[PDB]
Write a structure and sequence with these properties.
The structure is cut from a larger assembly and holds 8 protein chains of 8 kinds. Chain C contains 6 helices and 10 strands. Chain C is an alpha+beta fold. The chains are: A alpha+beta, B alpha+beta, C alpha+beta, D alpha+beta, E alpha+beta, F alpha+beta, G alpha+beta, H alpha+beta. Bound molecules: ligand A1A9B and magnesium ion (2 copies). It is classed as hydrolase.
Chain lengths: 212, 243, 231, 249, 222, 239, 246, 233
């Protein structure tokens, strides 16, 4: 599993893989690791599959409850801290989840939080979580710029997920890409890693070690 | 079943008053008179023993003035046993604050705790309120010397000089007449003694019917509970009695 | 008089008054009739509307694929009791793979109501029930009163003007008890029984509800146009 | 279950607490019991009025031991006194001895029983105790002491007093006869005279109970070998001793 | 020393079609190297055109199936006899499984039916409730033996158009009910050939817009 | 006095506190709901006590969910817990079944709380407020329900509760038909509210809202309600 | 274990305990709140009975719940502390779980919910306190003023008074408070507050206690000298009006 | 129960044209010690159900008491306890299976393997299994312990499928059961020569045979076995 999210001038870019494995056996490659909490908040599913999916859907329910109670969109910090307090109440019980809650509000702007099963809640600009976090971190930290266009930032997230899927054995399947602006999130397609690899190799002049 | 026997202590009258609170205040009205006066350099508490007998051992008797803390004392008016229950709770709360913050408890915090206990007894539980009125005399480094008063209603207030128990109206009028903001602790002693001797339903004010306390002052306060001989001495000195 | 404040107080004549007040609450409810042959069991109920803009309060509840009941009186208490009966049928089917006997259901309802008719702070239930079922013994019809009295009958009726339907069933007992293997005839007999309890009203598709259970016939409810053939 | 969670003793519009005054009245209608404090001990005494001459009065003790140095007498309802003496005997250990390794002081044991009685006057579903207690004790730091505990939960230290039917007259006789230079035998004699004044029937060592908190009796300790551990001070006088001091008079 | 879990073997497979769904499973129930039964079905019809199987620990599987049937019963009771949509059933099963997150139902769950648009649908659940809708999914002992085969013959993976030199992939199509039945039987025969815990019999439940039907086929008993 | 049980049955077979809460509701403000095949409209009389009160803070129409709205009449403070429970039940059914809760199911779940009173599974008194729960679901389309503190709920094509309920109900009974449109329902609610209100109905002492399958539950801002009031005045002055 | 239903309905539809708590509020000292263009002012009457009180330690009528919101009350002082403590605890909890201080409406809603629960629970009497909660939402300069009633009803007000003689002060405000032109400067708002109190206080400025709230947590209580200066200006203007009429 | 003490060995059961047959040895083993004989492990419930319990004998007695209490409770307020509303084998099974799965889920199971065999009211043959894990399976042949390993092949040679049940006679099934008991006595160290056998026939009823013994044993060839390889005398 490889999940990444970074904020730039155009908003927030989120990019995840789709591979779920039980050891050496890939259980699935159609997994949706971006959980649409609500039309304005997204979550990344890295760690325990059921843990992340169930608790982020519960987070979405709690966000809807907050909006019904206060007649106002819940802040990214508020939802991230709700999830953090929940997982801290379940600390030591065996949950394993490293997720990023990403949102674009009027009060906070673009905001990304990293929440882990150990209770750590960290507001950040560039976050990569998963078995292949190192590869995406390398690619992003090398080619990151706040002045990136929406197109260039989307491509950078996709390419980082591609590098992770290539090198990491536990990351792969397909790339899910989301772009979050203040008006909400926009899905930018599911890209099969098998074909994306050849496309990027031919167009970019990269992956020269691989022969094709 | 038992609904037929419930007195419903925590209910409002049609006028918007707590029945049991008013009745406890009426009960305390028959109790002894306790007066606190806070001067610029100390605090004085003076109370009249309603229970009086020639065989009453007054040396070991303490029915009106109790020590909550080395910095805080209380004058009691009303049911002594309810007062002692609340005093035990107050001592425990003061020591808990001391253990928590390693600083002596401020007076208002303890007063508010006791008053909230009283209030809780007037809003839930269906139990009778404590028939006790407290005059707190305390010292802390924030507000200096402090005089507070609390009644069964759960309300607490701050005073320069205050009186609880019997004939509180005449005592308060006399205090307002003779009190001065600049007066010293000995002047407060004299004023309290004269107010007691002029508001007592008894024939005369004697040492057997009196309890006295002074919180005085180095960087240390002294809480002195007057002994019967000291009480007779201060009575014959202030001119109330002859020896 | 002075003995009607609680259900924990006995009148000098040995009467629990709150229970009688609940029974009176039932009497002022709508009319529902039940009748059964050897093969089927039918509940016919007349729903009542607040006005012409309101709906008709449902009077028949499905408890299990083999047992249901019609209510007369407080709908909340009826829902509570029907939910308890659903729970008991569910427990029987899950722990013993066994359809709950109608007689045992009546016993459970009786004890459940008695729990409320003897303790302080608890009010007796305010609804009468007519339970139809088909267990291994055959078709069964029970009448349950919040006094805790449950009685098995070939036919009965509760609510307003129920005595007319009851007398009709008494007269037509030997007739309807032999209507075996013909659902529509028993349905028409029940419709006639409930009509024997109408005064200034006429049965319409909107105010009539029917429920049928029996051999090879699960507890099914007919409302709206489904009852047009029986009017 | 106990649905009586509300208080049964409430304030009347007159300010009086009804059940407390009624229990005090029931105390006033009880058999007289007195206490007298001297310079070398305290004495408590009461009349042993029995229900039937067939009943054995020795099996019913109105003067009970609370701690080895603290005893108590009562006036009022016997069963209330029994339950209070049991509670006091247990609270002496639980709230002092088991914490400090020593027997509680007279003042603190009196305060604990007074707290019990105050809770009885304030808690839900309970009537105040229909007794008034005279507790005589001795501790090392406060010396000898005599306390009175009323149904309201209040307590007072007394040089000498009495409670019950002939309470007023007994108190008057004690006010006239007491002084701060009395020996234990003098206090016993004064108590016997006051009881003879307060009794109409027979007056002998078999119809009156009398105990003393005096010196230490090591013969009643039960073991020898620990010099620091001395005998108990509480001792109930035998019928023979009471009859001897009565024939002396 | 008491191990509250056990393995009963078995293999189940669910394939979703355009206007149908199919959930099949072997009828063999085993324990260690012995056979407990040759016909203990694990693919159950739960009503509302929803077939369910929970393969693995047979006790936990039966418990979960019973609880889901009870949930469907109470759903009909409480919500005006409303039909339970397959996605609603999947979410309810996720919650049922995650309820025992720390005492998991040692079973892989697969349900099949028709969605609200009338299309075939299959949902898969891990022991703790992670759920996903998929075209084809196999679970159990021979899962690792069947899932790749499906990828080659259901989703046409690694299959490119002949003569295009791998430029154009194979055009995906919706397999007929007969084709998915052929594929299921071949998968289960191969599993019986290469897996010792699969055999005896294969039971297929076919969910169409007309309801649920059954198809039984004998398998090798070795 | 307070010497009988709060769950006591009257000799006529009714609960005392339930009837008394119904009286309390009769002493409440007006709330009128009308359901049509295009949506359900809810209007309430704000009934401000003093001119210094900011009429915006009178929220007597609340949102249970995007597809379920609720208007209150009576002791509106008692309705806070009811609205909270309704919202929680809606979102919990969504979390459990990945679907919107049916309107009738929500109304039944709310009514289930009514008779949970007496002398910690009980409360002191029944609610002193009636509810008009409007909504839309795929099963029964657009629905309007009246929920009383008696645990009983009824589906009305049009229902008025509160002070002046009798006349408003009669007007609804005479003016409602199965082909009514949304704007017609808005104008009818406005007219009946203006008829029953002691004060002159404007956009500040009245509040409008609707529930549509498309846009959901929308509370009308004061400007749109004022324009509808002007339309109603033009319709009445020319009829 | 004490679950006696004290707040129950009457045959006419009333809950007499709530109405008696309202009467207890009526017996309390007068308090008023007024909205300016950039501030909110809370005024409160002090008991002119005894002059022996200690003004340094006696609890003031205006209490801070958070650095940006204050709450005044009329009614039983004992019941007010319970609400103030619960409100402060909930404000801190909302700061802890939301990383954003409470809005005035949210705190008002919490207090109203507490009061409504106390009007519908067994063995519990309703609060004999009616409160005015005033402040500014975080990162917002718009004034906020709300009122809570023992029945649990809460509502926003441009200006409102609760306590003894509240009808007179409310009439004064309804006459002298222009919604179109609210008191622009703080001085105008404090002057209007003192004028509202002077119609009932009658004794002097020592009874009137004033607190001012301005955005970004600018809460300050005016000293008795400043209040007396305001009262003196108002009395001089009153004499000028009486002499111009002539 | 976390560790069995006194244990009961195998239980065997099969179906035949008119009903079911179950059997079990009468041995209570205290580990490796053959401590108790004459311990009946077949519990009849009514006239249509027999429960064969293998495992911890204390839990077996607990289940005996539970079955007796279930009969007593079904007799309560049931005028039809003699007919339609009598305890069916399926009811008794489902109850025992629920109890076993609950005890497993509470981490304190009943260390037993239970086989419920009987005839329903409609004449159908009911044969099912449960264990300490709550696992339930039904087959024409069912056995516990060494039974499941050795008796199951022999019994399945008679009824490999359901279609073989109508063809199997009561004599064939009883002979197969006796042969399986003899084989277990041959190759089971915790077996007993004394056993009990129940036959539930939809026509004949419940036939319960106690004190049976394994007969016709072949031991003569043991005289020719000498040494372990090279020895001759
Ligand atoms: C999916 C996107 C990101 N998440 C993953 O990708 C991770 N989980 C999975 O794949 C599969 C899903 C599947 N259908 O296979 N989860 C299980 O199997 C379940 N295990 C079980 O039931 C068991 O205890 C049995 C032994 C298995 C039959 C759920 C579970 C339970 C406890 C855990 O501590 C984890 C998962 C866990 C946590 C952190 C990372 C990982 C985990 N588990 C791993 O296997 C992984 O390593 C993988 O990375
Ligand atoms: Mg095989
Ligand atoms: Mg084999």
């Amino acid at each position: 599993t490889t999940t990444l999210a970074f904020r730039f001038q155009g908003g927030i870019i989120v990019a995840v893989d789709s591979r779920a494995t039980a050891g050496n056996w890939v259980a699935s490659q159609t997994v949706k690791k971006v959980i649409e909490i609500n039309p304005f908040l997204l979550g990344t599913m890295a760690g325990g599959a059921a843990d992340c999916q169930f608790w982020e859907t519960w987070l979405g329910s709690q966000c809807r409850l907050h909006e019904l109670r206060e007649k106002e969109r819940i802040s990214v910090a508020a939802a991230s801290k709700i999830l953090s307090n929940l997982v801290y109440q379940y600390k030591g019980a065996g949950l394993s989840m490293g997720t990023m809650i990403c949102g674009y509000t009027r009060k906070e702007g673009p905001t990304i939080y990293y929440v882990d099963s150990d209770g750590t809640r960290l507001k950040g600009d560039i976050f990569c979580v998963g078995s292949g976090q190192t590869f995406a971190y390398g690619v992003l930290d090398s080619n990151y710029k706040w002045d990136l266009s929406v197109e260039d930032a989307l491509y950078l997230g996709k390419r980082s997920i591609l590098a992770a899927a290539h090198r990491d054995a536990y990351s792969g399947g397909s790339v899910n890409l989301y772009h979050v602006t203040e008006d909400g999130w926009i899905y930018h397609g599911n890209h099969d890693v098998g074909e994306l690899f050849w496309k990027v190799k031919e167009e970019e002049g990269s992956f020269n070690n691989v022969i094709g | 079943g038992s609904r037929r026997y419930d007195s419903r202590t925590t209910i409002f009258s049609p006028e918007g008053r707590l029945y049991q609170v008013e009745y406890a205040l009426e009960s305390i009205s028959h109790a002894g008179t306790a007066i606190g006066i806070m001067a610029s350099d100390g605090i004085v508490l003076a109370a009249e023993r309603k229970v009086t007998s020639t065989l009453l051992e007054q040396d070991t008797s303490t029915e009106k003035l109790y020590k909550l803390n080395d910095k805080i004392a209380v004058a009691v008016a009303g049911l002594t046993a309810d007062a002692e229950i609340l005093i035990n709770t107050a001592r425990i709360h003061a020591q808990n604050y001391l253990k928590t913050y390693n600083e002596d408890i401020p007076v208002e915090i303890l007063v508010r705790r006791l008053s909230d206990i009283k209030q809780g007894y007037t809003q839930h539980g269906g139990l009778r309120p404590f028939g006790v009125s407290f005059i707190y005399a305390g010292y802390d480094d924030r507000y200096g010397y402090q005089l507070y008063t609390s009644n069964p209603s759960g309300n607490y207030t701050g005073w320069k000089a205050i009186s609880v128990g019997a004939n509180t109206s005449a005592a308060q009028t006399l205090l307002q007449m003779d009190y001065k903001d600049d007066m010293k602790v000995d002047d407060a002693i004299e004023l309290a003694l004269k107010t007691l001797s002029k508001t007592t339903d008894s024939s005369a004010l004697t040492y057997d019917r009196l309890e006295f306390a002074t919180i005085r002052k180095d960087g240390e306060v002294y809480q002195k509970i007057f002994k019967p001989q000291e009480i007779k001495d201060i009575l014959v000195k202030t001119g109330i009695t002859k020896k | 008089n002075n003995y009607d404040g609680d259900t924990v107080t006995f009148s000098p004549t040995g009467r629990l008054f709150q229970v009688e007040y609940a029974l009176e609450a039932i009497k002022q409810g709508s009319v529902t009739v039940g009748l059964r042959s050897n093969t089927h069991a039918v509940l016919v109920a007349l729903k009542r509307n607040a006005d012409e803009l309101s709906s008709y309060q449902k009077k028949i509840i499905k408890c299990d694929e083999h047992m249901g009941l019609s209510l007369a009186g407080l709908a909340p208490d009826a829902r509570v009791l029907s939910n308890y009966l659903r729970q008991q049928c569910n427990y029987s089917s899950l722990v013993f793979n066994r359809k709950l006997a109608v007689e045992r259901a009546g016993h459970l309802l009786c004890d459940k109501a008695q729990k409320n008719t003897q303790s302080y702070g608890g009010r007796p239930y305010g609804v009468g029930l007519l339970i139809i079922g088909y267990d291994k013994s055959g078709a069964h019809l029970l009448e349950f009163q919040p006094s805790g009295n449950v009685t098995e009958l070939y036919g009965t009726a509760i609510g307003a003007r129920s005595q007319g339907a009851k007398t009709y069933l008494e007269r037509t007992l030997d007739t309807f008890i032999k209507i075996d293997g013909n659902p529509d005839e028993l349905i028409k007999a029940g419709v006639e029984a409930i009509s024997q309890s109408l005064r200034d009203e006429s049965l319409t598709v909107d105010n009539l509800s029917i429920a049928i259970v029996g051999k090879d016939t699960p507890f099914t409810i007919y409302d709206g146009e489904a009852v047009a053939k029986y009017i | 279950t106990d649905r009586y969670s509300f208080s049964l003793t409430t304030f009347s519009p007159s300010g009086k607490l009804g059940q407390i005054d009624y229990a005090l009245t029931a105390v006033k209608q009880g058999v007289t019991s007195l206490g007298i404090k001297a310079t070398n001990g305290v004495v408590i005494a009461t009349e042993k009025k029995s229900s039937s001459p067939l009943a054995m009065s020795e099996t019913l003790s109105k003067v009970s031991l609370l701690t080895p140095d603290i005893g108590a007498v009562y006036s009022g309802m016997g069963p209330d006194y029994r339950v209070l003496v049991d509670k006091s005997r247990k609270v002496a250990h639980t709230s002092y001895k088991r914490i400090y390794g020593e027997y509680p002081p007279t003042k603190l044991l009196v305060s604990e029983v007074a707290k019990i009685m105050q809770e009885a006057t304030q808690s839900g579903g309970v009537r105040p105790f229909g007794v008034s207690l005279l507790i005589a004790g001795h501790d090392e730091f406060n010396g000898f002491s005599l306390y009175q505990v009323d149904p309201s939960g209040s307590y007072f230290p007394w040089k000498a007093t009495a409670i019950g039917k002939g309470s007023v007259a007994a108190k008057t006789f004690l006010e006239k006869r007491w002084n701060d230079e009395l020996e234990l035998e003098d206090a016993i004699h004064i108590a016997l005279l006051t009881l003879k004044e307060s009794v109409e029937g027979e007056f002998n060592g078999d119809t009156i109970e009398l105990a003393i908190i005096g010196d230490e009796n090591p013969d009643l300790l039960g073991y020898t070998g620990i010099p620091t551990d001395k005998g108990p001070r509480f001792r109930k006088l035998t019928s023979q001793e009471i009859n001897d001091r009565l024939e002396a008079l | 020393q008491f191990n509250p879990y056990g393995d009963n073997g078995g293999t189940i497979l669910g394939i979703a079609g355009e206007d149908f769904a199919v959930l099949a499973g072997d009828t063999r129930n085993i324990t260690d190297y012995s056979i407990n039964s040759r016909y203990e079905p694990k693919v159950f019809d739960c009503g509302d055109n929803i077939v369910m199987s929970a393969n693995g620990f047979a006790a936990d599987g039966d418990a979960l199936v019973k609880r889901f049937k009870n949930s469907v019963k109470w759903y009909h009771f409480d919500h005006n006899d409303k039909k339970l949509s397959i996605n609603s059933a999947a979410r309810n099963i996720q919650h049922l499984l995650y309820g025992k997150r720390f005492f998991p139902y040692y079973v892989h769950t697969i349900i099949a039916g028709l969605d609200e648009d009338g299309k075939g649908a299959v949902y898969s659940f891990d022991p703790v409730g992670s759920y996903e809708r998929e075209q084809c999914r196999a679970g159990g002992a021979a899962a690792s033996l069947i899932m790749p085969f499906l990828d080659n013959q259901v989703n046409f993976k690694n299959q490119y158009e002949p003569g295009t030199n791998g430029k154009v992939k194979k055009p995906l199509k919706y397999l007929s009910v007969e084709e998915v039945i052929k594929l299921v039987r071949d998968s289960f025969t191969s599993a019986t050939e290469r897996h010792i815990q699969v055999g005896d019999g294969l039971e297929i439940l076919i969910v169409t817009k007309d309801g649920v039907r059954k198809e039984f086929y004998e398998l090798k008993r070795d | 006095e307070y010497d009988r049980g709060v769950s006591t049955f009257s000799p006529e077979g009714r609960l005392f506190q339930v009837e008394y809460s119904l009286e309390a509701i009769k002493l409440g403000s007006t709330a009128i709901g009308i359901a049509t095949k295009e949506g359900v409209v809810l209007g309430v009389e704000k009934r401000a006590t003093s001119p210094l009160l900011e009429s915006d803070s009178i929220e007597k129409i609340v949102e249970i969910d995007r597809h379920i709205g609720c208007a209150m009449s009576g002791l509106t403070a008692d309705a806070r817990s009811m609205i909270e429970h309704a919202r929680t039940a809606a979102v919990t059914h969504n979390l459990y079944y990945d679907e919107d809760i049916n309107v009738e199911s929500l109304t039944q779940s709310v009514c289930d709380l009514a008779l949970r009173f007496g002398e910690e599974r009980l409360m002191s008194r029944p609610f002193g407020v009636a509810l008009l729960i409007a909504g839309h679901d795929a099963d029964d389309g657009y629905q309007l329900f009246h929920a009383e503190p008696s645990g009983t709920f009824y589906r009305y094509n049009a229902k008025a509760i509160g002070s002046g309920s009798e006349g408003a109900q009669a007007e609804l009974l005479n003016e409602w038909h199965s082909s009514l449109t949304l704007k017609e329902a808005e104008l009818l609610v406005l007219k009946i509210l203006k008829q029953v209100m002691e004060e002159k109905l404007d956009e500040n002492n009245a509040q409008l809202s609707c529930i549509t399958k498309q846009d959901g539950f929308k509370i009308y801002d004061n400007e749109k309600t004022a324009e509808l009031i002007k339309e109603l005045k033009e319709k009445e002055a020319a009829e | 274990g004490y679950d006696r239903a004290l707040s129950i309905f009457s045959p006419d539809g009333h809950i007499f305990q709530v109405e008696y708590a309202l009467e207890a509020v009526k017996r309390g000292t007068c308090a008023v709140g007024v909205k300016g263009k950039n501030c909110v002012v809370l005024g409160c009457e002090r008991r002119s009975t005894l002059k022996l009180q200690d003004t340094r330690i006696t609890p003031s009528k205006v209490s801070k719940i958070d650095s940006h919101v204050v709450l005044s009350f009329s009614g039983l002082n004992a019941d007010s502390r319970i609400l103030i403590e619960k409100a402060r605890v909930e404000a801190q909890s909302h700061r802890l779980t939301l990383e954003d201080p409470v809005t005035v409406e949210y705190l008002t809603r919490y207090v109203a919910g507490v009061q409504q629960r106390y009007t519908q629970s067994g063995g519990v009497r309703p609060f004999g306190v009616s409160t005015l909660i005033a402040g500014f939402d975080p990162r917002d300069d718009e004034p906020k003023l709300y009122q809570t009633e023992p029945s649990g009803i809460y509502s926003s007000w441009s200006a409102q008074t609760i306590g003894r003689n509240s009808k007179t002060v409310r009439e004064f405000l309804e006459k002298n408070y222009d919604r179109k032109e609210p008191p622009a400067t703080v001085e105008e708002c404090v002057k209007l507050t003192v004028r509202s109190l002077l119609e009932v206080v009658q004794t002097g400025a020592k009874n009137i206690e004033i607190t001012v709230v301005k955005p970004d947590s600018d809460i300050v209580a005016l000293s008795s000298e400043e209040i007396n200066q305001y009262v003196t200006q108002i009395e001089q203007e009153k004499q000028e009006q009486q002499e111009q009429d002539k | 129960t976390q560790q069995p003490i006194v244990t009961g060995t195998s239980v065997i059961s099969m179906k035949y044209d008119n009903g079911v047959i179950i059997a079990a040895d009468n041995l209570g083993s205290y580990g490796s010690l053959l401590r108790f004989n004459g311990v009946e492990r077949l519990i009849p419930v009514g006239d249509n159900t027999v429960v064969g319990i293998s495992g911890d004998i204390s839990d077996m007695q607990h289940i005996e008491r539970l079955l007796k209490d279930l009969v007593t409770e079904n007799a309560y307020d049931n005028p039809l306890a003699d007919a339609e509303e009598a305890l069916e084998p399926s009811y008794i099974f489902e109850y025992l299976a629920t109890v076993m799965y609950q005890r497993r889920s509470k981490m304190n199971p009943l260390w037993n393997a239970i086989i419920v065999a009987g005839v329903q009211s409609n004449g159908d043959q009911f044969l099912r299994y449960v264990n300490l894990l709550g696992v339930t399976y039904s087959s024409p042949t069912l056995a516990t312990g060494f039974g499941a390993h050795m008796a199951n092949p022999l019994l399945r040679k008679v009824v490999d499928r359901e279609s073989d049940i109508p063809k199997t006679t009561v004599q064939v099934a009883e002979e197969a059961i006796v042969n399986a008991m003899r084989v277990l006595y041959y190759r089971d160290a915790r077996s007993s020569r004394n056993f009990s056998l129940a036959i539930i026939d939809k026509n004949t009823g419940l036939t319960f045979k106690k004190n049976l013994q394994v007969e016709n044993m072949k031991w003569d060839f043991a005289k020719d076995i000498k040494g372990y390889g090279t020895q001759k005398i």
